[PDB]
Amino acid sequence: SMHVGIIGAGIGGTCLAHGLRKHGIKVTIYERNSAASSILPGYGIHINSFGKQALQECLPAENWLAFEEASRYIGGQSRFYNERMRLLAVQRLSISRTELKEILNKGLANTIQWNKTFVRYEHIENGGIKIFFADGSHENVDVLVGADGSNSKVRKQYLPFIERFDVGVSMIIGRARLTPALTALLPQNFRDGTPNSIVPKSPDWLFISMWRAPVNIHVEASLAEIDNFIVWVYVAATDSLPDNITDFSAEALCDLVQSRMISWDPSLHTLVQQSDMENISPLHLRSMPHLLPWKSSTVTLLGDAIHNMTPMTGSGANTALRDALLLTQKLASVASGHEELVKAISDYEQQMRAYANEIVGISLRSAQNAVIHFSI
Numbered sequence: 065s066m067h068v069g070i071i072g073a074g075i076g077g078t079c080l081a082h083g084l085r086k087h088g089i090k091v092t093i094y095e096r097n098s099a100a101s102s103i104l105p106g107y108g109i110h111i112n113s114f115g116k117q118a119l120q121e122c123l124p125a126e127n128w129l130a131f132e133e134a135s136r137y138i139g140g141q142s143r144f145y146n147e148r149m150r151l152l153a154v155q156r157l158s159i160s161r162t163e164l165k166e167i168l169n170k171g172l173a174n175t176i177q178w179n180k181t182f183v184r185y186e187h188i189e190n191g192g193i194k195i196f197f198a199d200g201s202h203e204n205v206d207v208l209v210g211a212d213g214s215n216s217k218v219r220k221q222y223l224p225f226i227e228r229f230d231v232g233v234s235m236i237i238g239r240a241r242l243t244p245a246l247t248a249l250l251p252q253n254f255r256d257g258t259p260n261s262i263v264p265k266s267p268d269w270l271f272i273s274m275w276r277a278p279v280n281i282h283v284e285a286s287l288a289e290i291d292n293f294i295v296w297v298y299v300a301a302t303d304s305l306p307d308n309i310t311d312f313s314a315e316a317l318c319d320l321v322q323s324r325m326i327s328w329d330p331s332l333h334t335l336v337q338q339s340d341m342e343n344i345s346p347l348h349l350r351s352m353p354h355l356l357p358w359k360s361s362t363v364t365l366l367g368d369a370i371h372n373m374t375p376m377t378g379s380g381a382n383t384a385l386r387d388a389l390l391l392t393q394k395l396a397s398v399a400s401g402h403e404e405l406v407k408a409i410s411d412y413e414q415q416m417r418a419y420a421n422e423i424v425g426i427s428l429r430s431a432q433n434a435v436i437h438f439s440i
């Protein structure tokens with residue numbers, strides 16, 4: 065009878081809705097986008113053990129089998145080189161974001177309410193929460209979950225004092241299709257599925273890995289053509305890049321990274337030169353301070369809404385999935401008669417803060433290490 069309203073049909077929100085349905089809980093998702101996107105995401109997601117367990121425990125079996133079918137293994141043995149190809153030091157599931165979303169959306173056609181942009185909520189005096197949308201509509205629910213991403217309006221209303229800070233580190237991310245030709249022109253360590261890190265003398269870094277991703281981002285999702293892409297990530301101090309790097313053309317971003325790699329091994333140049341000019345992304349890294357407890361209520365948050373101020377390279381998808389499994393389990397304990405609602409929400413929030421804080425800390429140190437090189 066408790067009706068859970070979720071803002072956002074992203075990774076976390078869809079996983080959550082599957083989980084709640086499994087436990088017999090009434091659930092609706094309100095999503096700002098239309099059911100058919102115009103552009104596909106150009107990137108891949110690597111699923112770790114937390115993400116994998118969340119998917120297997122929440123998804124209907126037919127969705128889980130589709131996930132197993134679409135994913136591929138991506139490797140361990142991460143290698144470290146200097147910038148002159150000298151080796152310094154030496155199992156996840158890889159899937160495209162577009163496939164993962166199609167799999168997550170399957171079975172939710174009559175759960176997801178499309179074109180519903182959350183604007184605010186109000187507590188109703190009888191208990192319950194009134195949700196207002198940008199088109200002027202409203203709905204009433206018993207529990208509100210903000211799964212609405214890094215700039216979550218739900219979080220901004222519920223926990224207004226949580227503020228992001230600039231890390232002082234920025235990155236430029238590109239992809240290159242592993243075509244027959246490119247495969248011939250790159251050494252095997254670029255294509256074998258083990259990630260590589262290039263550690264130069266300069267205060268910056270180049271990370272190399274692989275994504276499964278669509279060749280053409282301008283087709284319907286069900287028609288996406290999925291291939292292997294090398295992904296590269298150039299990491300440096302924000303102050304070492306142009307003030308307006310985020311407004312640079314793809315061509316200027318490419319030029320800039322090549323300028324930073326003068327003298328580095330030619331294979332690294334070949335990779336960057338052969339990258340896709342429609343999918344090069346500059347990003348300024350932002351983080352948040354340690355999450356302190358807050359008083360629990362029938363409004364809560366999951367995913368990037370509470371974990372990641374930057375939608376970035378990292379483990380955001382996995383953490384969003386982890387949250388969804390956890391919140392499913394806690395809301396199920398209320399449905400099944402074992403715990404009070406707000407107490408169960410509190411338990412979720414306390415556990416989530418513990419791993420959230422740990423992960424944020426790890427991410428921050430990793431970013432700093434790209435510039436300082438204290439780990440060598």
Ligand SMILES: Cc1cc2nc3c(=O)[nH]c(=O)nc-3n(C[C@H](O)[C@H](O)[C@H](O)COP(=O)(O)OP(=O)(O)OC[C@H]3O[C@@H](n4cnc5c(N)ncnc54)[C@H](O)[C@@H]3O)c2cc1C
Nearest residue numbers: 072074075076096109110182212213367368379380381382
């Ligand atoms: C290039 C790239 C590579 C990545 N690779 C990885 C990886 O390998 N592994 C990993 O674990 N993570 C990875 N991530 C991170 C991962 O994609 C995100 O952390 C993850 O999407 C977060 O899930 P979420 O459900 O919290 O938010 P999202 O998946 O962003 O979903 C938020 C949803 O809320 C909707 N929404 C927003 N505002 C409103 C509103 N006002 N009203 C209604 N709906 C709203 C959005 O439209 C969206 O559907 C990567 C990210 C990027 C950008």
